[PDB]
């Protein structure tokens, strides 16, 4: 509802997007589906057909006193194919549109509840300097945080591009994992309004 | 995510062989023979855990039978005498009295002998 930015100005955010509830089962599924979408799933193994050679019967079925065999590339043999060899596969799941929206509402609401959201009027850097933003985070009491602004600056990107546990994102490229991984979130008032409308 | 089972198999097989120490020949050396020796030992132990209670009562009764017959009657008449005198002493304690304190067992037989 009514939050206070760093300077002290009064900003009011909708409860439907910033004070909803914590649905852990809902948040877990959306977060874990995002992590499964990070996989590229590129691998394979050879089956019986795929391994080199092994087309002829190694010996006759009866008489030799050995276990019957049909190929030297059997999955029982050393160097043989893999029974159930792996192939490339897709790991991306479907999260329902309302499920993704609801999870982001739950995460942002929970971020406020544990005093991890920081509202600022604006966060701009005069020069593309890492030291300038490192100093601005210190006075903001967030040495490692996730900065969310509208129209991420072309020199604010360079300032944060070297700081270890610090990332600057557009509001339209914020993911559920980023809101949870980082210790704090510095959202501008303008960017908080975007989440108010988009959630 | 290939899983190599060598480490877990080694300590799994070692656990069975450690339990087979003192066995003769292959029963304490090779896992294939030791695993079914350890299982068979556990089966004997489970059955011998019932038979122990069964075997010590035979020992107590025989010791009591010797003690009662030394001075007076037999075991069959001794147990009847103790039952009629409302004496609850177990056969374990009786066999210990008979084998370790003959004066008390002599006095104990008399109480059973006067009751029949």
């Amino acid at each position: 509802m009514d939050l206070k930015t760093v300077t002290g100005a009064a900003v009011e955010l909708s409860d439907t997007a910033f004070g909803r509830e914590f649905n852990e089962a809902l948040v877990h599924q959306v977060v874990t589906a995002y992590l499964a979408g990070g996989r590229q799933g590129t691998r394979a193994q050879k089956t019986r057909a795929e391994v080199s050679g092994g087309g002829i019967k190694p010996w006759r079925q009866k008489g030799t006193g050995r276990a019957r065999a049909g190929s030297i590339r059997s999955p029982i043999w050393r160097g043989g194919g893999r029974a159930f060899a792996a192939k490339p596969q897709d790991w991306s799941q479907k999260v329902n549109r309302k499920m993704y929206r609801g999870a982001m509402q739950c995460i942002l609401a929970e971020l406020i509840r544990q005093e991890r959201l920081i509202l600022v009027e604006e966060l701009t850097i005069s020069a593309p300097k890492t030291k300038e933003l490192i100093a601005k985070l210190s006075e903001l009491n967030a040495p490692r945080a996730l900065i969310i602004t509208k129209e991420v600056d072309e020199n604010l990107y360079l300032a944060a591009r070297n700081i270890p546990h610090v990332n600057v994102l557009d509001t339209s490229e914020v993911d559920p994992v980023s809101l949870i991984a980082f210790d704090k979130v510095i959202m501008s008032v303008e960017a908080a309004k975007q989440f108010e409308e988009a959630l | 995510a290939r899983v190599k089972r060598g480490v877990q198999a080694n300590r799994r097989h070692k656990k069975i062989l450690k339990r087979a120490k003192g066995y003769y020949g292959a029963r304490s050396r090779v896992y294939r023979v030791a695993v079914q020796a350890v299982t068979k030992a556990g089966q004997y132990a489970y059955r011998d855990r019932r038979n122990k209670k069964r075997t010590f009562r035979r020992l107590w009764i025989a010791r009591i039978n010797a003690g009662a017959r030394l001075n007076g009657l037999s075991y069959s008449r001794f147990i009847n005498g103790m039952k009629k005198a409302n004496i609850t002493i177990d056969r374990r304690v009786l066999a210990d009295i008979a084998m370790h304190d003959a004066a008390t067992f002599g006095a104990l037989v008399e109480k059973a002998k006067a009751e029949l």
Binding site: - | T39, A41, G42, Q43, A45, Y46, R49, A85, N86, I87, T88, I89, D90, R92, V93, D96, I97, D101, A103, T104, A107, L108, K111
Partner: protein, 103 residues
């Protein structure tokens, strides 16, 4: 100078300051338990046999500690029947110290 007492479904021949372990009892460490239903008291030569209890005579013991016994492995196997079950067991016990045998 010995008595026969009942504890935990079993019977025990006890003497003074003897460490005797019995089945688990609901008593604290150092608590004193008195057994006033002794089955037989033999003080040197005099024999007092209870029918089924010796009147007046009693034994006071103190609960030294409570603990588990040695671990028993319980193995069940049915040959040619695809059946095998194992479990462990540790029996609970109390350590008693016989203080005195009141006549």
């Amino acid at each position: 100078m010995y008595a026969v007492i009942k504890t935990g479904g079993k019977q025990h021949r006890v003497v003074v300051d003897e460490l005797l372990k019995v089945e688990l009892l609901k008593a604290e460490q150092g608590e004193t338990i008195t057994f006033n239903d002794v089955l037989m008291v033999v003080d040197g030569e005099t024999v007092k046999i209870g029918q089924p209890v010796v009147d007046g005579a009693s034994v006071e013991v103190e609960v030294i500690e409570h603990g588990r016994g040695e671990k028993i492995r319980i193995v069940k196997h049915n040959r040619r029947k695809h059946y095998h079950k194992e479990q462990g067991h540790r029996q609970w016990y109390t350590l008693l110290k016989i203080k005195a045998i009141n006549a």
